[PDB]
Nucleic acid binder design. Structure first.
Ligand SMILES: Nc1ncnc2c1ncn2[C@@H]1O[C@H](COP(=O)(O)OP(=O)(O)OP(=O)(O)O)[C@@H](O)[C@H]1O
Ligand SMILES: [Ca+2]
Ligand SMILES: [Ca+2]
Length: 341
DNA sequence: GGGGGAAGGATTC
DNA sequence: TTTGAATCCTTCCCCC
């Protein structure tokens, strides 16, 4: 199998630049404002000018403004980025029928039946890159290798505006020398636990005791890392169906007062249904963030799709159940819909 | 013992 | 560490 992964560079920020080129060269920070106060919320993403100084995905807006008070701060316009994204993906479906859209700015192309060797893969890469730069003025990074994971790792090493192949020889090497925390799917919480087992490289999972690994990171991740270590990575390039849609919102102030919360909940539901757009869910879950930033949710599943009225009544019950089973005040309330027809 | 599916906390981005 | 959106993934429970 030959895999070509495409990762759009600092995507949200890059899109704002394209729609307004005068932003080029300037640090641009795309933000998601929470509303509890002035500048409340986190940064979704920033261009490289802003990242050189620490401003990156996740840092509070307030802190980003302390570092770069004159940077350009823009509100997240997901709808716009999604449309630009869809056009780019469609350009990609032209280089292969077997494409997996892993997210708004990532896609995996199984190009076996399109190229014979990496040289030809690399060259198809350049085509793809140029086509996107020309057509949309968006720079992306291409990763090419034997499977989805190493094709992603190839992109991670070459971004931004890069292109990199990782052949079978580099893979065997990476299995030995790559820091495990750089393995797609392994996050901070799993990364640290792996350090607590003497595991820093993929190869290290082959010596530990399975039941010990299984019971520390989980049977799924365990089996996952072992398969990569034995270089037998098992999971093809399939489509991908967004399986859930929701919305969480922040309230002006905390409270466990049903009538105070309802307006927010109902707003979450309306926005949620706007996105559903033709998709009929069968399950609904209500989500609440307590005053001490703890998450709590309660959902229910039906044998038929959920009309908006049912969604309306059912969410009050779920919210009430929550308020009942938890004594803390609520800070944020949201809903989530899934199991579509 | 274990398939199958809901539920809801945990973790990844 | 805030701080949103979505999936991951143990776990509980019905029941053969
Ligand atoms: N801590 C966080 N809080 C909020 N959104 C986050 C956080 N971490 C990641 N994201 C979201 O995920 C996106 C960053 O994802 P990721 O590492 O996958 O992107 P990428 O290929 O490098 O990013 P980019 O657009 O940043 O160049 C953005 C946002
Ligand atoms: Ca990207
Ligand atoms: Ca991304």
């Amino acid at each position: 199998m030959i895999v070509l992964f495409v990762d759009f560079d600092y995507f949200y920020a890059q899109v704002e630049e394209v729609l307004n080129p005068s932003l080029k060269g300037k640090p641009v920070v795309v933000c998601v404002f929470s509303g509890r106060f002035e500048d409340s919320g986190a940064v979704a993403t920033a261009n490289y000018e802003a990242r050189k100084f620490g401003v990156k995905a996740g840092i509070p807006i307030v802190e980003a403004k302390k570092i770069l008070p004159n940077a350009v701060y823009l509100p997240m316009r997901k709808e716009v980025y999604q449309q630009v994204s869809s056009r780019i993906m469609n350009l990609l479906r032209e280089y292969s029928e077997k494409i997996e859209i892993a997210s708004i700015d990532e896609a995996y192309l199984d190009i076996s039946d399109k190229v014979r060797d990496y040289r030809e893969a690399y060259n198809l890469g350049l085509e793809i890159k140029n086509k996107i730069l020309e057509k949309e003025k968006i720079t992306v990074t291409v990763g090419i290798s034997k499977n989805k994971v190493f094709a992603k790792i190839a992109a991670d090493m070459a971004k931004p505006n890069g292109i990199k192949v990782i052949d079978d020889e580099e893979v065997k090497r990476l299995i030995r020398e790559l820091d495990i925390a750089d393995v797609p799917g392994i996050g901070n919480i799993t990364a640290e636990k792996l350090k607590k087992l003497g595991i820093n490289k993929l190869v290290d999972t082959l010596s530990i005791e399975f039941d010990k690994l299984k019971g520390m990171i989980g049977e799924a991740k365990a089996k996952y890392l072992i398969s990569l270590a034995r270089d037998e990575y098992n999971e093809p390039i399939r489509t991908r169906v967004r399986k859930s849609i929701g919305r969480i919102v922040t309230m002006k102030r905390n409270s466990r007062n049903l009538e105070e919360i309802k307006p927010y909940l109902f707003r979450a539901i309306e926005e949620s249904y706007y996105k559903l757009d033709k998709r009929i869910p069968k399950a609904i879950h209500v989500v609440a963030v307590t005053e001490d930033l703890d998450i709590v949710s309660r959902g229910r599943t039906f044998p038929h799709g959920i009309s908006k009225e049912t969604a309306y009544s059912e969410s009050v019950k779920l919210l009430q159940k929550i308020l009942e089973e938890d004594e803390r005040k609520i800070r944020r309330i949201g809903v989530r819909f899934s199991k579509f027809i």
